[PDB]
Structures are given as structure tokens and as C-alpha cells.
Design a protein around this ligand. Structure first.
Ligand SMILES: COC(=O)/C=C/C(=O)OC
Ligand SMILES: COC(=O)/C=C/C(=O)OC
Ligand SMILES: COC(=O)/C=C/C(=O)OC
Length: 295
């Protein structure tokens, strides 16, 4: 898979170490290299990343800084061809510890917190019109929620509702604008990395109310059951996650002791995790997505 005429990189945006971060860095699995690119205009942790039409989007989060703490409603777009960030229309509400998924070229922003309240609301961005619109809210308030898309359906997995961390999960059916509960995970997880590989939704890591997790489980949408696979080498919560050429990559996080620079890669063929690189510095709460090499 080469986009146009160049390779695809794993982009990590933002994050947290002592304070919220503005870093944008790109990792190349083909040769091991890291590139530092244009900083975010506003530092942010607890954001999500996604790609539509080759462009990288940074959604939500919070600027934890000495000068103050501000939850973000921002949507910002990075163009690899220009190495520049551009503001887009802002969401209806600030959303820290947000989850994001893409269906049919549209960005869904799910859940997250604003101050002391925990959202169940969901809204959808149309890049063609630069507009957000609210859709049906989830059945559950969720922050630290993992999101993934499979077969043009949107899934919201785990999180924290303001009192309890959650093992529950739910699915959104766009043509009925309706959420439905699915089978709950076997583990309570907030701040897990959630992605899709083949016909399964993976939930890696997270926080269960006492411990950061290294376990990984996957939901087979045909069987409606969750099964554990190999655990990661590191326990981690608030990790970044993405898929690149058939493998899962997890980036950073917090293990109860250190903000991790470790990047691990899961090979589904062998059911093994391996360390593949280190980020340039340890951090948690990053947004991650995959698109073309920059100029
Ligand atoms: C923005 O993300 C955070 O502030 C998380 C910090 C943490 O759990 O490390 C002790
Ligand atoms: C052009 O509209 C699209 O749906 C493109 C999506 C994309 O770039 O996949 C990572
Ligand atoms: C309020 O409870 C916590 O300490 C949360 C820890 C966490 O999110 O994992 C690193």
C-alpha cells in the first residue's frame, strides 16, 4: 500500500508529559525513521486523530498547562503536502478524552468530558461542508472511550461514566440513527486503545479502576463474543493505537510508573507483540492516524 506514489506513516499528535503537548511526529515502519513536523497550534492531550481524504484531523482534547486547563472543542486539519495546520469548524461542545471514528468520509466525535460532566452526545463532521451536526446520543455517558468502525457501523467501547469504569460497549447504525448495546467486554477498560483488524474490534490496555492493563481482547462481530489474545509487553492506559499494513501499533501511554515511549506491534498471524521503535519522548493521551509521507 503506497498512497499516490509514496509510503504511509504513523502520525502521533499531541499528548501529555508534565503538561499537554503540541508535538506532531511521524514514524515510518518501512525504515524505522521518525520525523518532527509542524506543531499543533494549541497543545492538547486526550484528543483523537483520524484521516479523511489524505488529511490528518486532530479532534477534541484538553490543554493542561501552567496558565490553565481548557477543554477543547477544536477540529484542526494537517495537510502533509504543505506541512501546515488549518482550523476547521469547532464541535458543539468541548470533548476531552474523546473517541473518534470515520464512516463514509464523515468524522464521528463520541463522548468525552467538559469540566465535571461526562458526555453521551455524539456529533458528525462533514468535511465537504465544514459543518458539525449532532446525531443520536449513546445509551451511556462515556469518557476515555475507544471507538472503531467495522462494516459501516460505529462502535463505542468502555470508558468512564463519572462513577464507574465500564466494560460495556455499544454500536451505532447510521441509517436508523440508533445505538444498541453489544456484548460487554470481559474486562473493565477506560482509556484503552480500540481499533479494527479484519472482522474484529480490538481493545488493548486501559485502566480498570485499580491497575493499568496489558491484556488485549477482540470482539468477533459474527459470533458476538470477546476473546483474549496475547497481552502487550507493557501495561498501558491512555495509549495511542492504529493499524498499518495489517498489524496493530500501540504508542506510549502510562503504566503506573512511567510515561512510556515504547511502541509495540501486534502480528495477528503469530499472535505476538514486539517492540518496534521508541517515540522521541514518553507521553500519554496522543492522537494517532495513518496517511501519506509529508513534504
Ligand atoms: C492529560 O492526561 C493526564 O493528565 C494523565 C496523567 C496520568 O495519568 O499520569 C500520572
Ligand atoms: C476522500 O474521502 C475518504 O473517505 C478518504 C479517507 C481516507 O483517506 O482513508 C484513510
Ligand atoms: C482516578 O484514578 C486514576 O488514578 C486513574 C489512573 C489512570 O487513568 O491510569 C493511568
Amino acid at each position: 500500500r503506497g498512497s499516490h506514489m509514496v509510503g504511509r506513516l504513523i502520525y502521533t499528535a499531541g499528548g501529555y508529559f508534565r503538561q499537554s503537548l503540541s508535538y506532531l511526529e511521524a514514524y515510518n515502519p518501512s525504515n524505522g525513521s521518525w520525523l518532527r513536523l509542524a506543531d499543533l497550534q494549541v497543545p492538547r492531550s486526550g484528543l483523537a486523530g483520524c484521516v479523511v481524504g489524505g488529511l490528518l484531523y486532530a479532534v477534541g482534547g484538553r490543554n493542561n498547562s501552567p496558565d490553565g486547563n481548557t477543554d477543547s472543542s477544536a477540529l484542526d486539519c494537517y495537510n502533509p503536502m504543505t506541512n501546515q495546520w488549518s482550523p476547521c469548524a469547532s464541535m458543539s461542545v468541548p470533548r476531552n478524552r474523546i473517541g473518534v471514528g470515520v464512516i463514509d468520509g464523515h468524522i464521528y466525535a463520541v463522548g468525552g468530558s467538559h469540566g465535571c460532566i461526562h458526555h453521551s452526545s455524539v456529533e458528525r463532521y462533514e468535511p465537504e461542508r465544514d459543518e458539525w451536526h449532532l446525531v443520536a446520543p449513546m445509551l451511556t455517558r462515556r469518557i476515555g472511550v475507544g471507538v472503531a468502525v467495522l462494516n459501516r457501523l460505529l462502535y463505542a467501547v468502555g470508558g468512564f461514566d463519572g462513577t464507574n469504569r465500564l466494560n460495556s460497549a455499544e454500536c451505532y447504525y447510521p441509517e436508523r440513527n440508533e445505538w444498541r448495546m453489544i456484548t460487554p467486554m470481559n474486562t473493565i477498560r477506560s482509556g484503552a486503545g480500540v481499533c479494527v483488524l479484519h472482522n474484529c474490534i480490538y481493545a488493548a490496555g486501559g485502566y480498570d479502576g485499580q491497575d493499568q492493563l496489558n491484556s488485549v481482547e477482540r470482539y468477533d462481530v459474527e459470533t458476538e463474543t470477546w476473546t483474549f489474545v496475547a497481552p502487550m509487553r507493557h501495561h498501558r492506559s491512555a495509549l495511542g493505537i492504529t493499524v498499518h499494513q495489517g498489524k496493530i501499533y500501540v504508542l506510549g501511554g502510562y503504566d503506573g510508573h512511567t510515561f512510556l515511549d515504547s511502541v509495540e506491534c501486534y502480528d495477528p498471524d503469530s499472535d505476538t507483540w514486539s517492540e518496534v521503535t521508541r517515540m522521541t519522548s514518553g507521553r500519554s493521551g496522543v492522537g494517532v492516524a495513518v496517511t501519506m509521507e509529508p513534504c
